[PDB]
């Protein structure tokens, strides 16, 4: 809720970045192989931005990716259902 | 609400375009470096379109980008919750 759905998004967004590097390192070709850009990648995923920077190539990397979508889109379908109430409440008051 | 969540989206969409050029100018390679296409980029971000035209490469540019997603998706999860009521109200009446 308040900052609770928020926090869970960030657990996912770290572990998602961490496991991404672990799964993708070893597949010849992968771009998702340093912990920085792996983190940016999990945001580009939780938020459905689809910019096209990074993406996984290994099977397990795609599994990590799916979890980020589910657990992120859900968090963000609730962080953004929450940022939308208090600021509209603030300016509607 | 009415046009209030709307307006806040547009503050973000300008400052987002403005700061994007400032952060990305100086990094060798960036495409996000003129104020026009920087503005189009913040729409391609607030709306989750992910067309793949522009995107940031600097750290700070990505930070600007995240703010646009949060503050935009939220605005747009409310501009679009608002355009959906009055036109459906209009044609359901």
């Amino acid at each position: 809720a308040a900052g609770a759905a928020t926090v869970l998004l960030v657990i996912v967004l770290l572990a998602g970045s961490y496991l991404a590097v672990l799964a993708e390192r070893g597949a010849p070709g992968a771009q998702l192989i340093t912990y920085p850009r792996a983190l940016w990648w999990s945001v580009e995923t939780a938020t459905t931005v689809g910019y096209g920077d990074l993406y996984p190539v290994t099977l397990w990397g795609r599994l990590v990716a799916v979890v980020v979508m589910v657990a992120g889109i859900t968090s963000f379908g609730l962080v953004t259902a929450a940022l939308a109430t208090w600021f509209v409440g603030r300016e509607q008051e | 609400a009415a046009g209030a969540a709307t307006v806040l989206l547009v503050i973000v969409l300008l400052a987002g375009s403005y700061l994007a050029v400032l952060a990305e100018r100086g990094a060798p390679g960036a495409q996000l470096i003129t104020y026009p296409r920087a503005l189009w980029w913040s729409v391609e971000t607030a709306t989750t379109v992910g067309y793949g035209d522009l995107y940031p490469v600097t750290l700070w540019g990505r930070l600007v980008a995240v703010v646009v997603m949060v503050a935009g998706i939220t605005s747009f999860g409310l501009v679009t919750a608002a355009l959906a009521t009055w036109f459906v109200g209009r044609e359901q009446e």
Partner: antibody
Framework: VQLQQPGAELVKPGASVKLSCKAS????????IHWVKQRPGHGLEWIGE????????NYNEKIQKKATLTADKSSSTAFMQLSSLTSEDSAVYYC???????????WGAGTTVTVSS | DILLTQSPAILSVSPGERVSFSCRAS??????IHWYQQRTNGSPRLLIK???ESISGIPSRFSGSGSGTDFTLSINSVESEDIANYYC?????????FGSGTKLEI
């Protein structure tokens, strides 16, 4: 000295050998330990990486995979087992500390392996 | 497996002068190149990271240039202590790779 590896080994042809790299300083969860090989008068040949904490290792696709990587999670020392060597396998072997951001900040002194009878 | 190609192989120069080693990649890697110096008998040593950013404790002679498929290590001046081999290394796609190397003669 951060990364710290022995000076020189001597292996009979066909025999195995184990190589060490004890690393003071920090011992981060996310740290990776790489191994690079320098045949005399040659460039740098990446061999493979290992993240010690978690435990996985990935080797160089292209070279004849002779070796295997291991680590000791609460000794801060990592290992590399070269198995059945020729004289093509004689070189200097460095370990490197990649933080997870893509460059080898820290290098060991290098271990000189000479495969002869 | 990305190919880093350092031309030329050797580099002659008179002391105090500027000097630039080219590295050229077999496809775009943005800025994820890094430069290493390796003197005679010594281990390699990071010089420039991410193709432009400098390392703390490196002489201000060294300057990182380039982006895309063309990169450049440069030394704004030269003196006798910089004689060594020089290597690049991409970190943009697995596996990490190295350059052929360039030696610096005076």
């Amino acid at each position: 000295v951060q990364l710290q590896q022995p000076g020189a080994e001597l292996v009979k042809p066909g025999a195995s050998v184990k190589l060490s790299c004890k690393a003071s300083g920090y011992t981060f969860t996310s740290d990776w330990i790489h191994w690079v090989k320098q045949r005399p008068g040659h460039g740098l040949e990446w061999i493979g990486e290992i993240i010690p904490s978690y435990g996985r290792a990935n080797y160089n696709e292209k070279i004849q995979k002779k070796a295997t990587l291991t680590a000791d999670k609460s000794s801060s020392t990592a290992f590399m087992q070269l198995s059945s060597l020729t004289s093509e396998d004689s070189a200097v072997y460095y370990c490197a500390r990649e933080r997870g951001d893509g460059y080898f900040a820290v290098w060991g002194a290098g271990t000189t392996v000479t495969v002869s009878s | 497996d990305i190919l880093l190609t350092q031309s030329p192989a050797i580099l002659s120069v008179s002391p105090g002068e500027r000097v630039s080693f080219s590295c050229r990649a077999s496809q775009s890697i943005g800025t994820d190149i890094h430069w290493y110096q390796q003197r005679t008998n010594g281990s390699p040593r990071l010089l420039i990271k991410y193709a432009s950013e400098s390392i703390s404790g490196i002489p201000s002679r060294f300057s990182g240039s380039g982006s895309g498929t063309d990169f450049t290590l440069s030394i704004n001046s030269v003196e006798s202590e910089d004689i060594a081999n020089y290597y690049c290394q991409q970190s943009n796609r697995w596996p990490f790779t190295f350059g052929s190397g360039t030696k610096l003669e005076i």
